[PDB]
Design a protein around this ligand. Sequence first.
Ligand SMILES: O=P(O)(O)C(O)(C[n+]1cccc(F)c1)P(=O)(O)O
Ligand SMILES: O=P(O)(O)C(O)(C[n+]1cccc(F)c1)P(=O)(O)O
Ligand SMILES: [Mg+2]
Ligand SMILES: [Mg+2]
Ligand SMILES: [Mg+2]
Ligand SMILES: [Mg+2]
Ligand code: NA
Ligand code: NA
Ligand code: NA
Ligand code: NA
Lengths: 358, 358
Amino acid sequence: MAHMERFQKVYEEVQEFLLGDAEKRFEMDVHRKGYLKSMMDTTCLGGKYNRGLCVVDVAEAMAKDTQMDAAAMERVLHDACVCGWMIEMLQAHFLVEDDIMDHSKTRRGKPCWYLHPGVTAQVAINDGLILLAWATQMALHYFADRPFLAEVLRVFHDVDLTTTIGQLYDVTSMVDSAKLDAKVAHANTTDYVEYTPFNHRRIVVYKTAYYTYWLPLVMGLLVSGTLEKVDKKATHKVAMVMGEYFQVQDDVMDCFTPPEKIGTDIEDAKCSWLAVTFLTTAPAEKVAEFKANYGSTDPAAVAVIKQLYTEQNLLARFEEYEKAVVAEVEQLIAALEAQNAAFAASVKVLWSKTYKRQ
Amino acid sequence: MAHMERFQKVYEEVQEFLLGDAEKRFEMDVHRKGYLKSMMDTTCLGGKYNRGLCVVDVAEAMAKDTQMDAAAMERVLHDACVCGWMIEMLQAHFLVEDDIMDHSKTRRGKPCWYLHPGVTAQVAINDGLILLAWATQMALHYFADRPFLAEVLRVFHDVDLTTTIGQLYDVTSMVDSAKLDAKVAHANTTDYVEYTPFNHRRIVVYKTAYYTYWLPLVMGLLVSGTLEKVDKKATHKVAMVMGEYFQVQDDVMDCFTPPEKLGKIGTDIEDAKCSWLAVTFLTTAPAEKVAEFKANYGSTDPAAVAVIKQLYTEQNLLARFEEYEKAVVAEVEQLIAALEAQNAAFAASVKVLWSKTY
Ligand SMILES: O=P(O)(O)C(O)(C[n+]1cccc(F)c1)P(=O)(O)O
Ligand SMILES: O=P(O)(O)C(O)(C[n+]1cccc(F)c1)P(=O)(O)O
Ligand SMILES: [Mg+2]
Ligand SMILES: [Mg+2]
Ligand SMILES: [Mg+2]
Ligand SMILES: [Mg+2]
Ligand code: NA
Ligand code: NA
Ligand code: NA
Ligand code: NA
């Protein structure tokens, strides 16, 4: 951990600023102030803060790689926690909104924010918008005298964009893209036309890889003032490789591990690494059976799909994929190390947090 | 006339940049690109563009006052247009979300975006995020090297927060605020505990006045380099006053002025709106008038409606509004005079905007 202490304290610090700023600016009352506090805690807390804490570990390793008096170092660590929370708030913004779009039931053991008894979708959609707003507010306030403010905004807002596009690709893949037309319905169920391993790749990259991997790394570099020290290209590729792997692994785990949440990809008819890899490689009659049973809440259907995946050896094949990814990541790190050991060491520890999640 | 044609041309130019940039950055396919084109056209076009044109009116007024050359003037007019489109997209983004939040049916005599057959709420929620994302993109690209970029992003994102908090106030007027709690379900009907003048003023001011009156003014001073030529808080204050007044006037005409003098029914009583009329009445009326109000408000029977309008007359609410209107006329003219003493051209921009609000 190490930076968990520091990170949770900045949250409390940031919460108080954010609520206080609303009282100052928008005549905020005690009742709704209290509502926004429960809103923040419920949507932003619970996770393991891997993405936020990445900003911190990156920043630390870069500032430790220069000669910095404790004072500058402490400012770099605080600034890294604020970027960290910007990303956690960005994510939380996308979970809130995405749970409403998908009519999802639960989120980390609990009902989705919009299904909290005294919230409702009507309030929750705007709640989502407040969290995004707040992310920019942190930067505007905490980085007001920092040379990296313009860059943080640019890169954070490009990733907001990137992720909305990944979102677009993920909710417009139910039907052959050629039939997509605002003023004509195709409705209900998928035809699997877009369900190609490449299109899945396109989805995960924009929807997940940038905000989960690329954004923490760069904010890391931006707050520590070390962006010009590393190759843009290599930073992008390694973010993409890890980002791809992480989702491929989350997809496999949804279906394959006990794990003690309840995995719901099959019944939701998710465009998953499992689904796309199966559809493009399995024998003809298997494909027929898959299509007959996919995207059903019925537990018999779900069990058939899982049995089809097992017969296709998809678990062992993932581990093959995993091993091919190990090779790539290790190659990309070794290449980064030749340019800056501090950053590469950092990337080596973010890999160890992604690799073989259990 | 005058700048409408220039505004439309710029729209096309930004649409082309935005869609192309998506093709460049995210591998945007032809079909999803055509979808986003119709999403943009449907949500952003067909309105009055009054907020967007206002920026251009203001920017031109200030630019002529500086006596700058032809090449520079064109840049200022083009910058104004882009900014104007930031506001329209921001508005557009909030309509898309609000129509989903409130399960609205129509928008400018057309089905709401999410109600278009090949668009559901599941996609349309995210469409709205894209629109808000596009607003920042425009500034990031067109103003990449303009000195006013930081202030445009700050002012823009500050108004985005203000508007989400105005939305919050609007969606939390259902029950008594002492009862508002995420954990506890409340009725989907109104108890009128939040129907107060204070509350009505927060809703209109933070939900509407910042983006409708404040932002256009400040964007225009920003793109023409003239912000330091006006008093910031006289400008803000005049914006808050007009903005509140526009909505009070709207509520009154919705009830009192005939269907002929503004092509539309007039449905505020029947929809149970937190109107200026409702909140002024409940906060001042005798107890049994109040009890009669509650017994007849929010239902669609012409009998009950006529009763409410009788009650409004019997409380002399027109004279009350007339006294209110008189007070704002005085106040706005005072602030315009103050602005004239430092800058005459900006005062005339505010004048013309004001005369548009009567
Ligand atoms: O597994 P989840 O529920 O975290 C999910 O990734 C949501 N989600 C997470 C992050 C960003 C996003 F836009 C959307 P998905 O929709 O089920 O794939
Ligand atoms: O009078 P309407 O219905 O156009 C409204 O102002 C829409 N609207 C306009 C601006 C922002 C907002 F989110 C929502 P309302 O708030 O639904 O009454
Ligand atoms: Mg989803
Ligand atoms: Mg998952
Ligand atoms: Mg509304
Ligand atoms: Mg109205
Ligand atoms: Na914002
Ligand atoms: Na501020
Ligand atoms: Na954005
Ligand atoms: Na760019």
